[PDB]
Design a protein around this ligand. Structure first.
Ligand SMILES: CC(C)(C)c1ccc(C(=O)N2CCCC2)s1
Ligand SMILES: CC(C)(C)c1ccc(C(=O)N2CCCC2)s1
Length: 209
């Protein structure tokens, strides 16, 4: 059972701006997604202090970067708090509405796209390099879900029958044909060292066949 939802008008507008604006400094997408993963790991770590049973779904707090040239995907995996169905459909988009409008105002005043994270909508920077984004996520209080959008004003949510995850979030970036540099090991290392050097969780860059 696949449900299709329309983005809020403000978010669809932000997504089209990110897709259509000429902006060469695309590499900042990885810093934003890694920062999102770090925040989610901070969250489950905090909650586990007063309820250690919240780590029964996985004690390890880490971030994995997994490129796949065969599928032309870059996957960012974390074992953070994860997102409920309500997060995916309603809550996160509701927060992102004010941050979007503020970010658009700043862009008209002289700001640039790399400052998107200061407005809390850094996830959407994924569409600088991805034609489609799939988000697999599992929160302790809900089932495993798959969120997906190729932009165009709509996204889908379904119950995920893939491999069980334990807890956390997988962001699968289906890269644009001309953005395959972000599948190369030395390019990913360079970006992580430049923008994510002090993340307080182990970041493992997987290597391919
Ligand atoms: C896909 C969308 C827009 C719902 C997301 C916003 C932030 C996400 C994220 O990386 N995490 C949130 C907590 C788990 C890690 S996913
Ligand atoms: C991405 C953004 C900024 C819209 C978020 C809202 C709530 C987030 C979160 O980490 N939690 C969800 C579980 C409680 C803490 S992240």
């Amino acid at each position: 059972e696949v449900e299709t939802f329309a983005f809020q008008a403000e978010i669809a507008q932000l997504m089209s701006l990110i897709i259509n604006t000429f902006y060469s400094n695309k590499e900042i997408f990885l810093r934003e997604l890694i920062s999102n993963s770090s925040d989610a790991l901070d969250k489950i770590r905090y909650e586990s202090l007063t309820d250690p049973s919240k780590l029964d779904s996985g004690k390890e707090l880490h971030i994995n970067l997994i490129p796949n040239k065969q599928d032309r995907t870059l996957t960012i995996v974390d074992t953070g708090i994860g997102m409920t169905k309500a997060d995916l459909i309603n809550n996160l988009g509701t927060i992102a509405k004010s941050g979007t409008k503020a970010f658009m105002e700043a862009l008209q005043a002289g700001a640039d796209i790399s400052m998107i994270g200061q407005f809390g909508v850094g996830f959407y920077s994924a569409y600088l390099v991805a034609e489609k984004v799939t988000v697999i996520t599992k929160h302790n209080d809900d089932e495993q879900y798959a969120w997906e959008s190729s932009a165009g004003g709509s996204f889908t949510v379904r119950t995920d029958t893939g491999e069980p995850m334990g807890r956390g979030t997988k962001v699968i970036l289906h890269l644009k044909e001309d953005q395959t540099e972000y599948l190369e090991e030395r390019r990913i290392k360079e970006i992580v060292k430049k923008h994510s050097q002090f993340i307080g969780y182990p970041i493992t860059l997987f290597v391919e066949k």
